[PDB]
């Protein structure tokens, strides 16, 4: 016999993901001192459609606690969050929709 | 005649002393690259009876091969 | 004294310039694209004559490796004239043709007689 279609999927080739127009990987913040002890504030800049994904993605912006920079995070958009909203991530963030807590 | 004691010592590979040295050295050798220039022979007596001489032009290389 | 950065980077170390004990080549190689090499011979076709008479232009076959700056400097030195610009094409047979235009104070028709073209 010959190799069946299921076998051929694992070799990549014409069976790889179509990631040309995706907006990046949707992740939480990288845990640091701020989230280990207190909280950090962030503002929701945009909610965007991600090709190939049913859920929208939120583009949250934080202040870098060690440098003069803005960090852009690509979160999964919890239902009910809006642009211009403040979200807070950390151990002492308050139990509100869109906040990131342990 | 230290090369005589070392030779006998490296025959007791299951002794507590040599087991400790082989174990930590294997660990250290495992954190390096599969080919690595060694500054000097780890076994000066074994090296020399295989022809090694402690003079310029002789070099040592440690090679890691999968078992 | 202290490290304000969690990164470790290779420190900059002195880099000496080369000081060879001997030169690898005993003598420099002679220039093989001098002025006499660049200009092979002048073109004498019907259209080259038109260039001389109407456009104050000399037409030369030149080394394919030569560039416009080289052609211009070679033309001036060989025939002691001034050059306004140079246009170049590579012919279908592989030769490079140079359309050299002379300064207005020069007469290509006169210069051609000096060269022997006319």
């Amino acid at each position: 016999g010959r190799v069946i279609r299921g076998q051929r999927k694992g070799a990549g080739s014409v069976f790889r993901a179509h990631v040309k127009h995706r907006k990046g990987a949707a992740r939480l913040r990288a845990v640091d001192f701020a989230e280990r002890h207190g909280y950090i504030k962030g503002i929701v800049k945009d909610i965007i459609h991600d090709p190939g994904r049913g859920a929208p993605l939120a583009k949250v912006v934080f202040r870098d606690p060690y440098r003069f920079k803005k960090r852009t995070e690509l979160f999964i958009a919890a239902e009910g969050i809006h642009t211009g909203q403040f979200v807070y991530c950390g151990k002492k963030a308050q139990l509100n929709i869109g906040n990131v807590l342990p | 005649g230290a090369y005589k004691y070392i030779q006998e010592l490296w025959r007791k590979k299951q002794s507590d002393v040599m087991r400790f040295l082989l174990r930590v050295r294997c660990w250290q050798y495992r954190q390096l690259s599969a080919l690595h220039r060694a500054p000097r022979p780890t076994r000066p007596d074994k090296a020399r009876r295989l022809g090694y001489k402690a003079k310029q032009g002789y070099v040592i290389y440690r090679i890691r091969v999968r078992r | 004294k202290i490290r304000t950065s969690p990164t470790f980077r290779r420190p900059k170390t002195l880099r000496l310039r080369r000081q060879p004990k001997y030169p690898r080549k005993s003598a420099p190689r002679r220039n093989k694209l001098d002025h006499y090499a660049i200009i092979k011979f002048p073109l004498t076709t019907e259209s080259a004559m038109k260039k001389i008479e109407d456009n104050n232009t000399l037409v030369f076959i030149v080394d394919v490796k030569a560039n416009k700056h080289q052609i211009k400097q070679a033309v001036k030195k060989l025939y002691d004239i001034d050059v306004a610009k140079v246009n170049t094409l590579i012919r279908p047979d592989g030769e490079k043709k140079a359309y050299v235009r002379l300064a207005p104070d020069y007469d290509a028709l006169d210069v051609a007689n000096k060269i022997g073209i006319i």
């Binding site: 207190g38 | 010592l9 002393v17 660990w27 250290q28 000066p44 | 304000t4 969690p6 990164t7």
Partner: protein, 233 residues
Amino acid sequence: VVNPLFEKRPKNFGIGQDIQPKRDLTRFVKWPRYIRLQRQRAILYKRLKVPPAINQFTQVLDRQTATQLLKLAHKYRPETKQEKKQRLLARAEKKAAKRPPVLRAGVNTVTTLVENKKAQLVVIAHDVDPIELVVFLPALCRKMGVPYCILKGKARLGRLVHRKTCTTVAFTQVNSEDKGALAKLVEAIRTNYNDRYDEIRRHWGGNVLGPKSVARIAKLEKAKAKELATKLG
């Protein structure tokens, strides 16, 4: 007189607030692989169980004994290349118109001298690597009754013999004026090393957990002790 314009502008370094200062991150640096390797090897020698044959070398002379031992040895350094030429030339003129005592260097030369009982004092560097070169010498010297000591630094014994490094040196003879100094050093060295040999060779090393682990165990017990102490109050 103080300018009224000048003022304090303190920075608040709480979570949020102002950017953090450029403090010392030495502890959290990502070091090159070779640095991580030699440091993790020093932690293993503490963490693991080091046999007494290898661990005997952690016991060494104090600075004050090593200074005396090194000052006496400084008086018997082998003649350098330059000053041997002078000695040879001085012999040439001597021809036309004894061997003083000197240190014996090298694990191979010292081993033969110890076996022959021709050595009076053996000094062994503590950081020989591979350790197998000298891991047997303390036991050998003890068998032959040759007093031995362990000194900090194969490089210090290196400077004695005008070489980068030296595993071990041995006193074979001393001048009459220096016989008393050797007798004093031998006595102190003999008690610490040759006389305690029975306990030295049973004394394992290492087997010490890291500070965070030790604190974690100490805290866990202190809860029991305080709970035990609160049991009766």
